[PDB]
Amino acid sequence: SAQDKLIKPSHLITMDDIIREGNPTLRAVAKEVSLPLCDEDILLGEKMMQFLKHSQDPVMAEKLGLRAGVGLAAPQIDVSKRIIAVLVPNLPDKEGNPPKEAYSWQEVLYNPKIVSHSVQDAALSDGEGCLSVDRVVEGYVVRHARVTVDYYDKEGQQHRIKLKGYNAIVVQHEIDHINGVLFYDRINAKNPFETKEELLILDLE
Ligand SMILES: CCCCC[C@H](CC(=O)NO)C(=O)N[C@H](C(=O)N1CCC[C@H]1CO)C(C)C
Ligand SMILES: [Co+2]
């Protein structure tokens, strides 16, 4: 299967492993992962985290021809399992200094689930992109401004976390993937940049 090839020790995930719009796997509902976590799944998660790290390494990304990404879900690499990886980076300050800490959030979540959320919604002012989608769909991708997520880490320990801002946006984008949902599904087709008081607009800069 695909996962088998992906977990090969010397295998590096590249755009060649990312299925695109059209493959039915993107629209399927990923299956939960068995507990305790089996080797295959844990290794896949690490491969996913490593992919993200490589994508955010300007030289490496440039060498491998990768698109900088801040998250990835198993289905995107043709594995219909509820496994997602997030790597949300901090940005430089107003003065131009590099962030004190490269990442704001780094985690591989297994069987993640949204338990509660804010009444307010939120969308990145610049819209969203997806490496599984080879085209641009402009508009505000409407998501919950804040969410509480329950998931199991690679150790197999259950966690419950409160996310907001950029972290909340990224996690929902990834969770959408394991439910067969693509970002443009959350863009108001009749008015892509529709706004409402309850809709917070996030500027990353
Ligand atoms: C924001 C919600 C999470 C996005 C995750 C995607 C990666 C992905 O395809 N996950 O499934 C990404 O990094 N997309 C990028 C993206 O949309 N970004 C990167 C910075 C913030 C935002 C731009 O508005 C594009 C540039 C490839
Ligand atoms: Co995506």
CATH number for the domain spanning 203: value is 3.90.45.10
CA of 75 relative to ligand 1 center, distance in Å: 16
For a ligand 1 pocket test, name from 13, 108, 136, 173 the mutation site with the most ligand atoms within 8 angstroms of its C-beta: 173
Q: Binding site for Fe cation: what residues are annotated?
A: 130, 173, 177
Q: Which atom of ligand 1 is nearest to the CA of 174?
A: 11
Distance CA 203, CA 68 (A): 18
Task: Report CA dihedral (31, 128, 85, 165) to the nearest 10 degrees.
Answer: -110
Distance CA 67, CA 142 (A): 23
Instruction: Output phi, psi for 62, to 5 deg.
Output: -65, -40
3-state DSSP percent of the chain in helix, strand and coil, to 5: 30, 25, 45
Residues near ligand 1 with C-beta < 6 Å?
67, 69-73, 76, 124, 126-132, 169-170, 173-174, 177, 204
Count of domains observed in the chain? 1
32, 95, 174, 197: the active-site residue: 174
Distance CA 122, CA 178 (A): 21
Task: For 88-126, give one letter per residue: b (16+ CB within 10 A) or e.
Answer: bbeeeeeeeeeeeeebbbebbbbbbebeebeeebbbbee
Instruction: Output phi, psi for 144, to 5 deg.
Output: -70, 140
Atom 9 of ligand 1, nearest CA residue: 130
The 3-class SS string of 18-53 reads CCCECEHHHHCCCECCCCCCCHHHHHHHHHHHHHHH
Which ligand is closest to the CA of 48, given by its number?
1
CA of 129 relative to ligand 1 center, distance in Å: 5
Q: Is 155 annotated as catalytic?
A: no
83, 73 contact by CB (below 8 A):
yes
The CA–CA distances, whole Å, from 187 to 18, 120, 136, 140, 199 equal 23, 16, 12, 6, 13
User: Which residue has 């996913």 as its token pair?
Assistant: 48
**Degrees, nearest 5: CA angle 29-163-112:** 25
Q: Which atom of ligand 1 is nearest to the CA of 55?
A: 13
87, 103 contact by CB (below 8 A):
yes
Distance CA 87, CA 74 (A): 15
Distance CA 99, CA 92 (A): 5
Atom 8 of ligand 1, nearest CA residue: 130
Q: Which domain holds residue 39?
A: 1-205
Q: Which technique? A: X-ray
Atom 15 of ligand 1, nearest CA residue: 129
State the sign of the Cα–Cα–Cα–Cα dihedral 62, 135, 170, 10: negative
